[PDB]
């Protein structure tokens, strides 16, 4: 069979099923069994078989539009998607990655590869807005799909397409990377609201690869160097330790191998 498929829809609004979903994702992203201070580390990209390297997240609308997303199980980041018979991939910034993404949606008809990557500061352009100004929650997630599905048909502009990218990633990838950011989405939902992310989050997003590094190279959990994030008040502050982050960060990109 093909890569695993974790199914989710914005029709049934249950704020539980959202959670059961993010936990389905995390369950596929790693096996656990490697955990640094109770925080699971994603599988090491080195030696990892391509048949094991991707995950598929399918997403349904209330307009009943289905779009399948591909994530890299090493970074939990979206490498591309599939809507209808057309498949679109982010730019594979290295040779080895280029090879691997060709194992995705092999049976799709039209395979596109963008000239751009999937990193924020890049999409923050095409969208024309910024993460700070871009709306999230279950609201943008219905429209983020109707964008992607309708991109294959040229019915969605690129600006709103990169905008639709920025919504997806944060609400899947980052949600699964952080318990904190995961919880933040349920909130916008249970009361059915929609809004933009606070510095608490953004600083977490920019810092995820940073923290993973800091945590795994830490001496007994103590960061060799501090790291500055922000809270909703915008106030900056530093983390000297893995402790605080346990309720916050869920998965870590493999950085090093475990100590004694």
């Amino acid at each position: 069979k093909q890569y695993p498929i974790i199914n989710f829809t914005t029709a049934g609004a249950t704020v539980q099923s959202y959670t059961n979903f993010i936990r389905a994702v995390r369950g596929r992203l790693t096996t656990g069994a490697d955990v640094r201070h109770e925080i699971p580390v994603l599988p090491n990209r080195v030696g990892l078989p391509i048949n094991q390297r991707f995950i598929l997240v399918e997403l349904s609308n209330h307009a009943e539009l289905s779009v399948t997303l591909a994530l890299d199980v090493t970074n939990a980041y979206v490498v591309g998607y599939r809507a209808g018979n057309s498949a679109y991939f982010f730019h594979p910034d290295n040779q080895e990655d280029a090879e691997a993404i060709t194992h995705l949606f092999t049976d799709v008809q039209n395979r596109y590869t963008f000239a751009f990557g999937g990193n924020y500061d890049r999409l923050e352009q095409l969208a024309g807005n910024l993460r700070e100004n871009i709306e999230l929650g279950n609201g943008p997630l219905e429209e983020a799909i109707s964008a992607l599905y309708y991109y294959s048909t040229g019915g969605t502009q690129l600006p709103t397409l990169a905008r639709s990218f920025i919504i997806c990633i944060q609400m899947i990838s980052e949600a699964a990377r952080f318990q904190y950011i995961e919880g933040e989405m349920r909130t916008r939902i249970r009361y059915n609201r929609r809004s933009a992310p606070d510095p608490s989050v953004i600083t977490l997003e920019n810092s995820w690869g940073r923290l993973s590094t800091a945590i795994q190279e830490s001496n007994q959990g103590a960061f060799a160097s501090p790291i500055q994030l922000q809270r909703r008040n915008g106030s900056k502050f530093s983390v000297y330790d893995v402790s605080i982050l346990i309720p916050i960060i869920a998965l870590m990109v493999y950085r090093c191998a475990p100590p004694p």
Partner: nanobody
Amino acid sequence: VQLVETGGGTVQTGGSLRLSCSASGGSFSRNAMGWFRQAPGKEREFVAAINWSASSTYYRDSVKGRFTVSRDNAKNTVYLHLNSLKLEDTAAYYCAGSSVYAEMPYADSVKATSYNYWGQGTQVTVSS
């Protein structure tokens, strides 16, 4: 990104010439490039296309195994090598990249609609 084309001019039946297009700035080398041509009073034709890598090349049926398209992302130029020139090939040759896609399905690669930026169209004529 802006394109400039080189080569092109008087050639004789069965000869060779090499067209090149140098891109200064922009996303080039993350971009798919393609070559198109038109003779006067004749239809616009797809000639060749090449992706970013570039591991995928497509050629107009009539030119298959005659023309070869190349690129150097380090030199920021894309090459169209024209060998064994038939009279059929007399035309102005245009090079066009797409800043949106590093690669395209070839349904899109064959159409000039899919490319958002062009060169100035160096002229090519084949005598005999």
